Design an enzyme around this catalytic site. Sequence first.
Site, PDB file in Angstrom:
ATOM      1  N   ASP B  20       0.882  -1.184   0.000  1.00  0.00           N
ATOM      2  CA  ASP B  20       0.000   0.000   0.000  1.00  0.00           C
ATOM      3  C   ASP B  20       0.921   1.237   0.000  1.00  0.00           C
ATOM      4  OD1 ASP B  20      -1.704   2.176   0.643  1.00  0.00           O
ATOM      5  OD2 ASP B  20      -2.883   0.982   2.069  1.00  0.00           O
ATOM      6  N   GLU B 112       1.324   1.855  13.196  1.00  0.00           N
ATOM      7  CA  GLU B 112       0.201   1.785  12.277  1.00  0.00           C
ATOM      8  C   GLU B 112      -0.765   0.781  12.858  1.00  0.00           C
ATOM      9  OE1 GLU B 112      -1.231  -0.304   8.733  1.00  0.00           O
ATOM     10  OE2 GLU B 112      -2.480   0.510  10.349  1.00  0.00           O
ATOM     11  N   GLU B 121     -10.118  -4.212  15.267  1.00  0.00           N
ATOM     12  CA  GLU B 121      -8.949  -4.956  15.776  1.00  0.00           C
ATOM     13  C   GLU B 121      -8.511  -4.501  17.158  1.00  0.00           C
ATOM     14  OE1 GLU B 121      -5.798  -5.867  12.843  1.00  0.00           O
ATOM     15  OE2 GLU B 121      -7.093  -4.835  11.387  1.00  0.00           O
ATOM     16  N   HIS B 269      -5.396   0.171   1.082  1.00  0.00           N
ATOM     17  CA  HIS B 269      -5.861  -1.184   1.386  1.00  0.00           C
ATOM     18  C   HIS B 269      -7.043  -1.216   2.378  1.00  0.00           C
ATOM     19  CE1 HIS B 269      -3.719  -1.059   5.167  1.00  0.00           C
ATOM     20  NE2 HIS B 269      -4.178  -2.261   5.464  1.00  0.00           N
TER      21      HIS B 269
HETATM   22  C1  LIG Z   1      -2.458  -2.671  11.120  1.00  0.00           C
HETATM   23  N1  LIG Z   1      -3.432  -1.873  10.385  1.00  0.00           N
HETATM   24  C2  LIG Z   1      -3.747  -2.326   9.004  1.00  0.00           C
HETATM   25  C3  LIG Z   1      -4.497  -3.628   8.967  1.00  0.00           C
HETATM   26  N2  LIG Z   1      -4.940  -3.961   7.606  1.00  0.00           N
HETATM   27  C4  LIG Z   1      -4.298  -5.150   7.035  1.00  0.00           C
HETATM   28  C5  LIG Z   1      -4.839  -6.442   7.634  1.00  0.00           C
HETATM   29  C6  LIG Z   1      -6.355  -6.530   7.520  1.00  0.00           C
HETATM   30  C7  LIG Z   1      -6.849  -7.758   8.249  1.00  0.00           C
HETATM   31  C8  LIG Z   1      -6.699  -7.874   9.627  1.00  0.00           C
HETATM   32  C9  LIG Z   1      -7.131  -9.020  10.280  1.00  0.00           C
HETATM   33  C10 LIG Z   1      -6.974  -9.120  11.783  1.00  0.00           C
HETATM   34  N3  LIG Z   1      -7.157 -10.472  12.344  1.00  0.00           N
HETATM   35  C11 LIG Z   1      -6.100 -11.416  12.014  1.00  0.00           C
HETATM   36  C12 LIG Z   1      -8.122 -10.807  13.220  1.00  0.00           C
HETATM   37  O1  LIG Z   1      -8.102 -11.848  13.854  1.00  0.00           O
HETATM   38  C13 LIG Z   1      -9.214  -9.824  13.480  1.00  0.00           C
HETATM   39  C14 LIG Z   1      -9.411  -9.319  14.759  1.00  0.00           C
HETATM   40  C15 LIG Z   1     -10.448  -8.441  15.010  1.00  0.00           C
HETATM   41  C16 LIG Z   1     -11.291  -8.039  13.986  1.00  0.00           C
HETATM   42  C17 LIG Z   1     -11.087  -8.530  12.700  1.00  0.00           C
HETATM   43  O2  LIG Z   1     -11.957  -8.082  11.689  1.00  0.00           O
HETATM   44  C18 LIG Z   1     -11.813  -8.573  10.390  1.00  0.00           C
HETATM   45  C19 LIG Z   1     -12.579  -9.655   9.985  1.00  0.00           C
HETATM   46  C20 LIG Z   1     -12.429 -10.152   8.702  1.00  0.00           C
HETATM   47  C21 LIG Z   1     -11.512  -9.585   7.835  1.00  0.00           C
HETATM   48  C22 LIG Z   1     -10.746  -8.515   8.250  1.00  0.00           C
HETATM   49  C23 LIG Z   1     -10.893  -7.999   9.528  1.00  0.00           C
HETATM   50  C24 LIG Z   1     -10.058  -9.425  12.443  1.00  0.00           C
HETATM   51  C25 LIG Z   1      -7.706 -10.017   9.504  1.00  0.00           C
HETATM   52  C26 LIG Z   1      -7.811  -9.831   8.135  1.00  0.00           C
HETATM   53  N4  LIG Z   1      -7.398  -8.722   7.496  1.00  0.00           N
HETATM   54  C27 LIG Z   1      -6.997  -5.255   8.062  1.00  0.00           C
HETATM   55  C28 LIG Z   1      -6.395  -4.008   7.427  1.00  0.00           C
HETATM   56  N1  LIG Z   2      -0.359  -5.348  21.484  1.00  0.00           N
HETATM   57  C1  LIG Z   2       0.606  -5.581  20.562  1.00  0.00           C
HETATM   58  N2  LIG Z   2       1.926  -5.711  20.859  1.00  0.00           N
HETATM   59  C2  LIG Z   2       2.873  -5.935  19.919  1.00  0.00           C
HETATM   60  N3  LIG Z   2       2.570  -6.048  18.604  1.00  0.00           N
HETATM   61  C3  LIG Z   2       1.281  -5.933  18.186  1.00  0.00           C
HETATM   62  C4  LIG Z   2       0.201  -5.692  19.157  1.00  0.00           C
HETATM   63  N4  LIG Z   2      -0.969  -5.630  18.507  1.00  0.00           N
HETATM   64  C5  LIG Z   2      -0.669  -5.805  17.195  1.00  0.00           C
HETATM   65  N5  LIG Z   2       0.669  -5.992  17.024  1.00  0.00           N
HETATM   66  C6  LIG Z   2       1.355  -6.177  15.737  1.00  0.00           C
HETATM   67  O1  LIG Z   2       1.225  -4.923  15.074  1.00  0.00           O
HETATM   68  C7  LIG Z   2       1.333  -5.088  13.650  1.00  0.00           C
HETATM   69  C8  LIG Z   2       0.314  -4.191  12.957  1.00  0.00           C
HETATM   70  S1  LIG Z   2       0.455  -4.252  11.179  1.00  0.00           S
HETATM   71  C9  LIG Z   2       1.619  -2.943  10.888  1.00  0.00           C
HETATM   72  C10 LIG Z   2       3.020  -3.522  10.682  1.00  0.00           C
HETATM   73  C11 LIG Z   2       4.108  -2.479  10.439  1.00  0.00           C
HETATM   74  N6  LIG Z   2       4.280  -1.606  11.594  1.00  0.00           N
HETATM   75  C12 LIG Z   2       3.769  -1.631   9.240  1.00  0.00           C
HETATM   76  O2  LIG Z   2       3.323  -0.493   9.362  1.00  0.00           O
HETATM   77  O3  LIG Z   2       3.916  -2.071   8.119  1.00  0.00           O
HETATM   78  C13 LIG Z   2       1.174  -6.582  13.415  1.00  0.00           C
HETATM   79  O4  LIG Z   2       2.421  -7.137  12.985  1.00  0.00           O
HETATM   80  C14 LIG Z   2       0.744  -7.166  14.763  1.00  0.00           C
HETATM   81  O5  LIG Z   2       1.245  -8.467  15.034  1.00  0.00           O
END
Ligand SMILES: CNCCN1CCC(c2cc(CN(C)C(=O)c3cccc(Oc4ccccc4)c3)ccn2)CC1
Ligand SMILES: Nc1ncnc2c1ncn2[C@@H]1O[C@H](CSCC[C@H](N)C(=O)O)[C@@H](O)[C@H]1O
Lengths: 330, 331
Positions: B20, B112, B121, B269
């Site tokens: 992204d 992030e 999340e 994204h």
């Molecule tokens: C770190 N910030 C950028 C994250 N940015 C890339 C990752 C993207 C994402 C994360 C997750 C997080 N994940 C692993 C969970 O277990 C989770 C937890 C709470 C809620 C949740 O809601 C979703 C349900 C289905 C699909 C997606 C989310 C998922 C799952 C799928 N896609 C989300 C967008």
């Molecule tokens: N409470 C916590 N302590 C440490 N890591 C965490 C956390 N909650 C989420 N993470 C981590 O935070 C990341 C968010 S995704 C962002 C990844 C990277 N900083 C970037 O900007 O590209 C994931 O790798 C996830 O495993």
Amino acid sequence: AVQYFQFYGYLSQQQNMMQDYVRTGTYQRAILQNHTDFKDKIVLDVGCGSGILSFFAAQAGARKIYAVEASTMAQHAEVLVKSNNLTDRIVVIPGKVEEVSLPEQVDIIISEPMGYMLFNERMLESYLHAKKYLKPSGNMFPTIGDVHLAPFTDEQLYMEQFTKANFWYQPSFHGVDLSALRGAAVDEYFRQPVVDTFDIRILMAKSVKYTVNFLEAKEGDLHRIEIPFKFHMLHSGLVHGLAFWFDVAFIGSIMTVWLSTAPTEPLTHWYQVRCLFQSPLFAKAGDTLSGTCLLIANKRQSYDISIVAQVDQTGSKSSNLLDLKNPFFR
Amino acid sequence: AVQYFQFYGYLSQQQNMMQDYVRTGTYQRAILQNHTDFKDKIVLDVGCGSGILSFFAAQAGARKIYAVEASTMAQHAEVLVKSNNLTDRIVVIPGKVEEVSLPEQVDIIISEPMGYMLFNERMLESYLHAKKYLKPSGNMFPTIGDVHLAPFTDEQLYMEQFTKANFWYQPSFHGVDLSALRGAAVDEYFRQPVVDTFDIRILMAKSVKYTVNFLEAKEGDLHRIEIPFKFHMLHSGLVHGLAFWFDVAFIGSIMTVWLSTAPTEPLTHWYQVRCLFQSPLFAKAGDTLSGTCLLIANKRQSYDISIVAQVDQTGSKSSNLLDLKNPFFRY
Ligand SMILES: CNCCN1CCC(c2cc(CN(C)C(=O)c3cccc(Oc4ccccc4)c3)ccn2)CC1
Ligand SMILES: Nc1ncnc2c1ncn2[C@@H]1O[C@H](CSCC[C@H](N)C(=O)O)[C@@H](O)[C@H]1O
Ligand SMILES: CNCCN1CCC(c2cc(CN(C)C(=O)c3cccc(Oc4ccccc4)c3)ccn2)CC1
Ligand SMILES: Nc1ncnc2c1ncn2[C@@H]1O[C@H](CSCC[C@H](N)C(=O)O)[C@@H](O)[C@H]1O
């Protein structure tokens, strides 16, 4: 286990399966065309979901159907039984088939417990477990399951893994050298079975099959699935991996009905599954590609897939380890 | 939570975020153009993933960077720190930011942690928790987050979801009457937020903005998020629901840089998110659409969303519950 049953608690996910016309229509045909296996009988539906297969058993004349469902879909199935005026013939029992009690033994067990590569999700173990409720010489629908394996060539599928992984093979991604992770990225992609369909022309030999007879098999027999293979190659080429599909047969008194997920047949919601080899194997027409596919059950309701293979004439060997719980939908 | 960290342990998922360009490029611009906030400073990267933001902090001249990461991605970050000869400045710390012990207070926290609709999340709580390590004078990048809500009209989207739900209207599906579940199906389908992008022309009024200031917010503030709204309808038509996006600002000592996920901005994204009403509200231009969006944090790292909206001029009301953990990604 919680996530697993929550998933099946969604009407949209039950709908996905119901809308697979080959699947749902073949089950209906299997049951109705074998009406003497149902007329005035006692039925167990293992994992009834919406209740659909139990309604088919009722259509074929069953006296009493115990419809067991572990997810909250049990509450929706109950609504449907009442609204279809079938309270006296279909009894919805909420819970796991391993934990509930049935008030009597049954003549026949029906279920749709098939995952990708037949065994994914491990629900066939629950289906076999349910045989504790089956009267002596009772039947099971489906009765047997066949897993087919065959070598394929797909140069583009193989190449793709490197194209994706080579994201990491650059010295200045926003000033960062990412190259040290390229190998790990490759490994990660090769661990995913590929779920999609393909042209039968990619297959390089006649399939081998592994059969489970559900009337005889015990739960524990599905913990370790060893599939030896010896393919006699129909075409010269690079073998990039093994393709998998499966068939189940409903062996009734009147006729045997088959549900097939083969690439020669119309597409189902299961598609087919392909496992790549780490390194492709050259084989000439008439050579023998031998080895074993081992499916080892794990604590995530799935299997680790171990494939070792060699071309007997050359001795060139390859292998792969794959995680059936992390398929790639292509 | 075991599944959560497993997901972020995949290099493919880290790649998805890294690729992204708007996201990753804007983080880099924010950090490099505010290099005086990093030069010879101590930094904490909350959830470092690949390490990418910590590399940016190093580029801006940071003395030392604690790169905290709870997934197995920590091991890959360390491979990169070594291969990039930055062992003298980036210190990978495996584990949850809540449970590790940093040796030092920090001048600035970078992260992030934004999910869909900003809050999904619940990682912002980890980001806010990490302020226990922030010096009194310290900064946070991003500094604030704005959530935007606006009413939309999209009959095609509404009918797509309605048609799926109406599979359960069928009185004779292979001879079976499904119709008693029609209502249950509509409830379930319309509980799914729709994640995709759309043309700005679908928006029927100016957005309402809710702001969280990460310098001031406490972790517990995000457990209940109440967003009142009063839209002044600019077009007549059916209101099919509310559309959401978010922006974050990096308020540096030199310059403020924005990362926007708005539908007027290049795609990221995160796309945008839409919460559909089970039944649309008819509005005229000049009407007011008022109500409340209430987000209640739950034990699945997400939120239960309540949206109650009414057209004041007619008393026409829509009450909706959505599950932010069950989004529909639309192609
Ligand atoms: C770190 N910030 C950028 C994250 N940015 C890339 C990752 C993207 C994402 C994360 C997750 C997080 N994940 C692993 C969970 O277990 C989770 C937890 C709470 C809620 C949740 O809601 C979703 C349900 C289905 C699909 C997606 C989310 C998922 C799952 C799928 N896609 C989300 C967008
Ligand atoms: N409470 C916590 N302590 C440490 N890591 C965490 C956390 N909650 C989420 N993470 C981590 O935070 C990341 C968010 S995704 C962002 C990844 C990277 N900083 C970037 O900007 O590209 C994931 O790798 C996830 O495993
Ligand atoms: C009941 N017979 C037909 C099932 N038929 C419709 C359902 C379909 C399916 C099920 C599951 C099962 N699930 C909720 C799991 O928790 C689980 C458990 C073990 C393994 C597993 O492997 C998968 C991973 C990703 C995608 C799919 C499976 C998933 C998830 C997604 N899609 C599978 C195909
Ligand atoms: N051990 C077990 N006990 C009871 N139900 C189970 C189970 N394992 C899986 N299930 C249920 O089995 C169903 C499989 S999906 C098949 C649903 C329906 N019979 C149909 O053919 O359309 C799911 O609803 C799942 O929740």
